[PDB]
Design a protein around this nucleic acid. Sequence first.
DNA 1: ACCGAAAGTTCAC
DNA 2: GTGAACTTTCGGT
Length: 31
Amino acid sequence: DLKCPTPGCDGSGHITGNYASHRSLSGCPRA
DNA sequence: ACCGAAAGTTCAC
DNA sequence: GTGAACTTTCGGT
């Protein structure tokens, strides 16, 4: 999507640290 | 069984 | 090569 489906998730970050910014449920920093 | 979240390659610059 | 990006797999309900 154009942004993570998670309301509280901004998308600028990651859990493991494989991305700096994303727009999916691929390791949402703030889920 | 279904679903939210964690997870690394990939096309584009 | 680096940079922003997603569906898959796993855990949870």
